[PDB]
Amino acid sequence: VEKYSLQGVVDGDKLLVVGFSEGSVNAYLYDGGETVKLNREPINSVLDPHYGVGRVILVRDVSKGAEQHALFKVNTSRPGEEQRLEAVKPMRILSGVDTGEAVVFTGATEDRVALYALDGGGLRELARLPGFGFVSDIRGDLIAGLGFFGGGRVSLFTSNLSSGGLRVFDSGEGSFSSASISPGMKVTAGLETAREARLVTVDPRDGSVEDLELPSKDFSSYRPTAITWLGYLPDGRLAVVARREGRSAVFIDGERVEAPQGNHGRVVLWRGKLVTSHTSLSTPPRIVSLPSGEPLLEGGLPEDLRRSIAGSRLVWVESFDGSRVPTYVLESGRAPTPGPTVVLVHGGPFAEDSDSWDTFAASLAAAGFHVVMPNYRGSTGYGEEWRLKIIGDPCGGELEDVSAAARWARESGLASELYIMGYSYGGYMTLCALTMKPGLFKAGVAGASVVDWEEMYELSDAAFRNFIEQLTGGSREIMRSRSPINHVDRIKEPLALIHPQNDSRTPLKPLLRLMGELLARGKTFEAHIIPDAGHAINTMEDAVKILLPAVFFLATQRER
C-alpha cells in the first residue's frame, strides 16, 4: 500500500510529499485534493525544501540501488521536467536542504564525507565531516547539522554558506537528535543523554550549551526521553516532536498538540494549519492534519492486514546484565498462543522498534507469526546510555538482550518455536545469534546482513569506514571476532540469506564468501540475491522482493 512522508512546503502553500506509491518513490505536490507528480522516473528521496520555493531537488539512484545519487532540480511549476545538477558527481547524499538560490547537502565518497554547496558559481566543498553527517538546518549564511563522529555519539556541526568551514559541538551529557536554526542563530538542538532529554541553545561563536526553556511546559512535563525531530515554523513557533517508549507528542512552544496515537515527525505550516506524518503499528506512514487528526495523505490500507494482528504489547525483558530491554509484541491472529514466533530485530542499530508501522512486523503476523521487536542496547529512544552500550561491543550485550526477548517468549507462553529474523544490522544479528548462540532459535533469516567487518571495511566509502571503527572502538580484533564469517564452523539451525546485489552498505562480495563458506562446512541454508536492488526499496515491489523468500523459508520450518 501507498505511503507518504512529509518534506515540507513549496509553491507557496502546496504541500510537498513523497510516496512509496505504485511500485515507485515519487516526489509529489499536494494542494488539498489531487496529488501532482514532479519526478519523471522513480526517485529515491527529495532534499529538505525551504518553505515556498518554486522548484524541487530530487535525489535519484543512477546506480540501481548502489546508493550513488544524482541531483535533479525539478521546477515545481513544470511537473516532470528535470535538470541533473551536473556539477555534482553521483554519490551518497546523506541529506541536504534547498533554499531556492543554492543547495547544500552532505555527500560521502570512497575518499570522504563532506558538506557540499551548490549555488550559482558551481560546486564547492564546504567542510569534510569525520563520518556520517547530516544537514539539520540552514538559516541565513548559517549551516546547522548533526554528525556521527565519535563513540556512537552525535555531535552538532556548523558550517557556512560562503566561507564554509566547521566547528564540532559535543556534549558530555549525550548526543544530539536534531536541530534547526533560530532568529538568534543559536542552534536549538535536543540533547539526548543517558539520562533523559531536553532542548538546549548551542551558540555558534563560543558554543554555549545553555538549557532552552519553553512557555508551555507540557513538553517540560511529558518528560521526553528522546526528541525525534524539531524546528521552527514560519510563524516562528518551535515544532518539537519528542517521544518516549515508541510514541511521540506534538509540542508547539511547549504547547502540546493532540495527535494520532503512534508516531510522527516533521511538522509543517500548510495553509496555517499544523500538519505532520503519522504512523502506528497498525497505520502505515501517512500525512494527516492536527490536532483534528484527519489524514491529508494516507494510502488504502486493507482491513485484514490490520486484522492480521490480534494485538500489541510493550513488555520489558529481563536481560542477562539485569537490563530491561523494552520489547514490542504483535500477536498474529492467524496463529495460536503460544505459536511459531519470529524475533524481528530492527537494523541500525541506532534505530528502534516503536509504536510505528513495520511492514515486516505486519506481513509476519499476517503469516501466522507473532513478532518480537526488541530495542536492544544500541537502539534509539531509550536513552543515550542504552544506545552507546553497543559501541565497541557489537554482537555482545545487545545480542544477549536480543536473546532475552527470545527467552521471554517461550516462558511467556507465546512461542511454540522461535526464529530470528533481521535486515541490515538485523541481518547481522541473525548471523551472530546463530554463530554465537547456535541454539537459541530454530532458524534465522538475514538480509542486507553484515557478515565481515574487515571486508565491509575494505569495500566501504568514507561514510561507512568510520562508522565501523566506532561500533568496535577502533579495533580490528573486533572486526575479527565479531564477524560471523569466522564463526561459520559453529552454526546449526537453518538460515536464509536474502541480499540485494547492488547494496553498498552491506556489500554482496563478503556475503558470497559466506555462502561459499557455508557450502564447505556443508551447512543447511538458502540464498536470495535480488537484482538491481540496493539496501533500501525505492519501489513498492522490493519490499516483497526481500520478504517473499523469507516467509517461505520461515514457513518451511513451521512444519518441523
Q: Could you tell me which residues come within 8 angstroms of residue 559 by beta carbon, excluding any fewer than 6 positions away?
A: none
Give me the catalytic one of 424, 460, 483, 504: 424
Q: Take residue 198 and report the three cell numbers written for it.
A: 531536553
Tell me, in Å, the resolution of the deposited structure: 2.7
CB distance 25 to 45 below 8 Å: yes
What domains appear along the chain, each with residue ranges and CATH number? 1-300 (2.130.10.150), 301-560 (3.40.50.1820)
State which H helix or E strand residue 404 sits in. Answer: helix 397-411
State which H helix or E strand residue 17 sits in. Answer: strand 14-19
CB distance 320 to 397 below 8 Å: yes
Give me the catalytic one of 95, 355, 535, 542: 535
- HEC string for 304-339: CCCCCCCEEEEEEEECCCCCEEEEEEEECCCCCCCE
One-letter amino acid of 426: G
Residue 424 annotated in active site:
yes
Q: Take residue 278 and report the three cell numbers written for it.
A: 503519522
Chain-centroid distance of CA 347 in Å reads 8
Q: Take residue 528 and report the three cell numbers written for it.
A: 536470495
Q: What angle do CA 408, 414, 418 make, to 5 degrees?
A: 70
**Helix/strand/coil percent split, the chain, to 5:** 15, 35, 45
CB distance 129 to 147 below 8 Å: yes
Q: How many CA atoms lie within 13 A of 485 on its CB side?
A: 21
- Looking up cell 564554509, which residue turns up? 164
Cα(289)–Cα(90) distance, rounded to whole angstroms?
36
- Looking up cell 526553556, which residue turns up? 213
Report, in angstroms and rounded to the nearest whole number, the Rg of the chain calculated over CA atoms: 23
CB distance 555 to 522 below 8 Å: no
Chain-centroid distance of CA 343 in Å reads 19
CB distance 148 to 131 below 8 Å: yes
Chain-centroid distance of CA 131 in Å reads 17
Give the DSSP letter of residue 162.
S
Cα(387)–Cα(66) distance, rounded to whole angstroms?
28
Q: Could you tell me which residues come within 8 angstroms of residue 458 by beta carbon, excluding any fewer than 6 positions away?
A: none
Q: Take residue 393 and report the three cell numbers written for it.
A: 561491543
Solving technique: X-ray
Cα(256)–Cα(239) distance, rounded to whole angstroms?
10
State which H helix or E strand residue 454 sits in. Answer: helix 453-458
- HEC string for 503-521: CCCCCCHHHHHHHHHHHHC
Cα(176)–Cα(198) distance, rounded to whole angstroms?
10
Residue 503 annotated in active site:
yes
Give the DSSP letter of residue 163.
S
DSSP state string for 331-385? E-TTS-SSEEEEEEE-SSSS----SS--HHHHHHHHTT-EEEEE--BTBSSS-HH
Q: How many CA atoms lie within 13 A of 424 on its CB side?
A: 14
In the sheet where 295-297 sits, what is the strand order?
A: 268-270, 273-276, 287-289, 295-297
Q: Take residue 496 and report the three cell numbers written for it.
A: 536464509
Q: Take residue 465 and report the three cell numbers written for it.
A: 569506514
CB atoms within 10 A of CB 448: 28
CB distance 24 to 39 below 8 Å: no
- Looking up cell 495523505, which residue turns up? 297
Helix (H, G, I), strand (E, B) or coil at 278: coil
Helix (H, G, I), strand (E, B) or coil at 398: helix
Give me the catalytic one of 503, 504, 528, 542: 503
Cα(156)–Cα(167) distance, rounded to whole angstroms?
8
Helix axes 425-435, 397-411, angle to 10 degrees: 80
One-letter amino acid of 65: G
DSSP state string for 3-41? -EEEEEEETTTEEEEEE--TTSBEEEEESSSS-EE--SS
Q: What angle do CA 254, 384, 137 make, to 5 degrees?
A: 55
Closest listed residue to residue 162, CA positions, set 104, 202, 206:
104
- Looking up cell 556541526, which residue turns up? 157
The torsion angles phi and psi of 333, rounded to 5 degrees, stand at -25, -40
Cα(59)–Cα(52) distance, rounded to whole angstroms?
19
